């Protein structure tokens, strides 16, 4: 077996004592292994997957793999394999292309990998994604192969927005499901997994203490509330930025000062729009956005000396590091760890003062400097793109006539039932008890004993 | 000016400074007033309102009566009424039938002087609840008076799931606004009032150290996650009931135990059922559901000596109160406060160890034993409740012709815009800076400046 | 029986009830009673006592009385009696002098009922005070009285320093405990009691919303801690002043922003030394210090429009009432609840914008505006009362030769293991379960299985 | 330069990045570097030192040098080092023999070779330890060179213990700082540095979701009490076991449930004395005694599968290893995180259910499995350390007559004045700042304006 690339095999042994480790730890996952493994439901399922090559995201692949689906796999990040992942992954005979510390052309080696197999288009019948950057290029590249393919499980906020955009301008080509939308994905990863691995990176990157420390947490949805809440548990003193003045008002209630790096939230781009004042204070700020230039020039020039700057939205332009490699000195303290030296870009002063460090280069930092999100949380997100794929393959997309393809090119998300099954498997790995409704309680809220429990307005 | 019913009139001058005090507190609902005071849009509305007769109601009534509306008002619960709310409101020259400690006889009688005056129908054309019953009243007794009437505006989860089985069942004979699923009514009121008002009701009725002692949380909606939060920063030790999977996930990963009051989840009816163990080391038990019995005869028989009993869910039923009522003695401690003698029902012994402390009879428990949420969380709620009736007066529904009608003839939510529009008011009330968007991310976000900022199916 | 002077005699039986549910929340305090009730250890004790006239004070009085002594009692503040406790106590036929909302006039008189009946001085043989007071008024005008007074026991920080001044100046006349360096008094009351209780008196005041809003915490010893965690728990923005150092390290390690009033800290008592940006955006300050003018004139003028202003230290001269009550109008709001209208003294606007809100007019907030500490956690603090009590009763220091004095004259803590037993006492109450070390780990660490388990330079 | 054993010199560059960085979080510790460098205070200090080889100590070392010090440097724990700070302080030719990973052969050949210098005795004049192995060593092995030795500064709980041993024995031949006890190193270090360091290395270690799992913590001193709250702010249910009564009262007041592993907390060697019910539910054991075996053999049999076991106490004996070498098989997942198989000890089964995950071999968790505390918590026991070396080193006990000697051997702390002077710069590197007391209200609490602000009784 040849028909991978990673950093070291030799890592395989210490990769599957942590995913059969993991396993312990996803009983959902595991739970559809054991349900779904007689029944074969991915047999003949050619899966094209491209998402962080962690641990978690192994128990994944060997559970499509136990449903009977062939893969070829690669991360969607150059910083967030986890290299003894990856071994384990390959030394099972599985081809993979991801190693921790790509360059941009390593990562777009890697997804071409998938794509071909002997220097041809891969069979290929379904794709997994987070991001849409492997659903880009076989859009934009691979046309041909789109038209054998039944659908698209894409993992997160940024790749659906991507597909939606898609669907609106007519040039998406295969129904998705978006996974990201699930409760036991959104309100569990995004939030959860945040709080857990935010502090776990700065952490590992930095050994600073944070308790005491001003933080500023650009953007309050599902990965900001989390990341809030993975400092101020710290004892950081945070102050959360939004535009959405709903998740705003959920900032104040959840005791955080809303602040605006800008004078009166106003962002015209100029130096003098810039609260000096307020950037001069904070110690830490981390963008949570999914938007671009969320961490201006203008507010780096501004920041505190010797403040932290990450980001944790899936893409790295929600900082301006093009900027920063523009106009400063770069000191690598050791990988996923640099020291900007504002001082200028004619090299550097290891004794200067006046640095920032950033984490990850600007990409995503619980991935880029520690293990992501806890394999027991990823649990839920990967529960989920099991049964999307289970879906979207047994619907059989590619093999409808032109007018029934018409009636299906869609992006939607996983029933509510699947979801509260999904989360009933994740309570009792906590050792909850759910309660069961009486027949007169079912009644009297107007449900089924065996749910689903909440209309489809409920927001949770 | 004698048309109205209230304790003692001369607590009029504090209730008057109290609703003075809870302007400064409320700047979305007083922004509603600087805004639409010259349009007077509730020109000619006369509003039947059914809600607590708390200060931030007295605000909520002199604001429909800023924009032009007459009102006839009563509170929803016999033990939520402000005796000083009510004065001021009935000294302004408002009809108000309100007072704490009401029997259910005076709660009746309290909404007929509402439906009647001078012993007919009053010309009613709009109606805002909290609950449901003065809705179901207008609908089984008089439904002549719905007629004329233009709209409902509907407070809380309670009384939403009324409307919509009146809407299934086609009896609904007027449209409404479900006030409750604006964000900044449910995920604001709903969830983050609990939190403030809880602990609040419980120190005011009993004076009990809170900290290092075992709680129960029955449901984890939005009241349980509110009134989870009230209990566990106090440093109680909080377990969490559910029949939700996916709201018991939540209580997990937010640090609660999740547990049944019956072995396995199931209650089949039999003391054999009750999980003993548990209920007899629990200190408070909290019903959060909107359910029946969910605080049940077997359980009450099960908890610890001195466990103090409350329900913060809509109705009494969450806790079975007429088994307490037909078996065990009641002593009063003070108003709202009782020690339930399990000895019997034969009078009671002063010094009997073996008692339960009921709060509020069973009654919601925030505004029986103290002041509900505060005012600054009302305003969200009160701001959607005003706009509310400005839409549905508007909209005229009384006048359509049948076949209008039957087209208007639903349960809606406000527009996310205008949720947005509240939200910011409240966050510019915390001297929070809410960021504007530039254009270039607008457009890469897909949204415009102005919002909305989220698309409908946005959970927060 | 007429030897008492309360507000309502007829409050008595709510009073006696509610003393019944404190009885089961002071587990040390009623165990106290069952070992001692035989031995009647206080046999021929007469106490003068002068502490808050509390439930939790009465099940001290009725401890002390069920040990043998008489007591004549009064409250150490005009604004912390609870009228039904001082009516239970009369009506039990023990002297008592105390109601709500005294004047300094009458407060005097009270403190003068207890030292003479029938208008002679009472033969009174011990003091049990909170904050030197009684203690100070013997001294100076009832020295003969001291001739046969055995000893003091002192509940507070502010009446210790006062003996020690006292003992440092040869002007001691009897000895002293100090009760409030007990770890189950000053480590538990001072700050878990101000955790409980200073949210508590500020929900019961103004029923204000905390979440969200901004705090300045002056003082960051226990009762400092206590409070900022008070208001920390509810989601307030807590900023913390001290003077001294360790305090605040503790501080900002705690997660809290330490600021000074004034401009680098220097309080020259000009107002440009005042951070007027600072105390612009604060929304609540608590005094802590047990100092004077610790929130001063200029630092008032400075406050944010409709900041809270109130002071849980022992005395009313930590903020500047007296430049209040010299230069602005209050309005009462209710009692212990004060507008201060900074327009001016010529009387007010009921709609002026710019007032702040006085609780208890500066006097101890948490017993003014609340019930102050549980009395789960007052069991501790009076647990050590008695134990004090008994000590220095028994040691009968009014009978020893002038020679023996000399040797006995001294401010004194308990020994730890009686500290150590009160804590037994009050984990058992949670239901707690102590380890108890094996002769091996006992040998290992030194100590003896029994205890004392800490040497006494240990600081817990 | 050849006078060192570290694992990779060529990590050195790394290393020195690392203390740059550190140096900027050390304020208090790089404040006594610019304040004494000129009068060079250990100019003749030649300090034999012992302790975790960290980059925090590389920084204390550096200052010992700045000061005029020469040293001979060793860890105090086998699995402590990072040998990036060991290669950096080796590379500026300083001796060091130090490396993660050691044996304890390994570990006693590192101390021996700071105490020998080509083979003889080292001119040593000063001690530095950690935990009191070098301590030991000295007077059991090299009473000699105790002789010509000035003092000893010991860092920690356990070594302090051993060193009052000693006093009490008549067999400590030196004079000691107890550098623990210092407010800015016990009630900072011990406490503050745990809550930042256990979850850190838990995750660092196992990568497992805390939130939503039980923990149980065997102790509340110092360690136990930021260790349960290292747990708890990351959402885990925290059970606490104590002895102590009066540290048990603080933590059901911090809102944990405290328990016993033992049946009445009686430990009477039976498997019969075993909470098997609480045990069997616990996810996680954290050990912060100081003690022996209070994680035995019959609470190791009892835990819950898979649950994961760790020491953050200076010593490995407080989990029962022993019996886990001797009965069940280790498997290695990775350095210092090992599956304890209990199924036996012939092999073991890769996919057994039945295992425990011990971290560090049951050795100081913190800093086996990450980094130890952060560099800002080391600057408070570090500048303690440097000021107690600066005092024994000026006292010159090794000079002083037979008569003097008696008179000055002691285990001592250091002033509070120093405490508090640590402290402000500790205060000052978060920004804070310290409010100056007026003369009026120096003269009301009776400090100097200047401090110290407490009374050496204070506990904070
Ligand atoms: N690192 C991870 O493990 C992880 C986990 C899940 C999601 N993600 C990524 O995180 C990003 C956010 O995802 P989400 O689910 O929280 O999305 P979301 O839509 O729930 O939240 C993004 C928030 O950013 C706010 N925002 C936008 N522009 C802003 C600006 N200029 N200033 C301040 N606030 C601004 C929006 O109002 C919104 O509330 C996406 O890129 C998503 O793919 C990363
Ligand atoms: N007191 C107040 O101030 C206040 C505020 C808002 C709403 N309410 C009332 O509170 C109630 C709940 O409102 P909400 O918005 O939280 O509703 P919700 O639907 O958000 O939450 C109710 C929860 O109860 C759970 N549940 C139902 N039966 C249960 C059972 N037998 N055991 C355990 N859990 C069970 C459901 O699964 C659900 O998650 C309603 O009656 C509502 O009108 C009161
Ligand atoms: N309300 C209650 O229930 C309650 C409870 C216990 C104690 N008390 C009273 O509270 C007061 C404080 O008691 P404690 O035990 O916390 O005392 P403490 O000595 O532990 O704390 C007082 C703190 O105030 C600080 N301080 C002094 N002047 C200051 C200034 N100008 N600015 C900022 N900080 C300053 C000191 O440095 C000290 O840390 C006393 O008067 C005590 O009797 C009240
Ligand atoms: N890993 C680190 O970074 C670090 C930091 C500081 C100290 N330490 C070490 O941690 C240990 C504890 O230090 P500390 O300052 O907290 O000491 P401490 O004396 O403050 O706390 C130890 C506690 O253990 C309790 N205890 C003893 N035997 C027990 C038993 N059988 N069951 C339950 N509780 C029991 C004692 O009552 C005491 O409260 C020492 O070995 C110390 O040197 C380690
Ligand atoms: N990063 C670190 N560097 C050095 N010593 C440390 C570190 N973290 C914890 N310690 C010390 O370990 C000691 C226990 O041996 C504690 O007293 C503490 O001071």
Redesign the pocket.
Known sequence: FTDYKVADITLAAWGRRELIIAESEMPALMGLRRKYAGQQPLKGAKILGCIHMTIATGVLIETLVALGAEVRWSSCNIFSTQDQAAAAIAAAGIPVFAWKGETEEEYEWCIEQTILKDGQPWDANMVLDDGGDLTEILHKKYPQMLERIHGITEETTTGVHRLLDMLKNGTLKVPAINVNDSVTKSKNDNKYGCRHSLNDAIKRGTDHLLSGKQALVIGYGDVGKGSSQSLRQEGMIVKVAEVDPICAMQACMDGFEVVSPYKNGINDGTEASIDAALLGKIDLIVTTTGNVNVCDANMLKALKKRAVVCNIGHFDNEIDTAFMRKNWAWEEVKPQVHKIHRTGKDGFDAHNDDYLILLAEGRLVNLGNATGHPSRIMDGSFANQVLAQIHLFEQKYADLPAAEKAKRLSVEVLPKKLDEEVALEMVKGFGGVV?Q??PK?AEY?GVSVEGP??PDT?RY
Request: proline share 0%.
């Open positions: 309660t409704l009486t309680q809220i429990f909440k409920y």
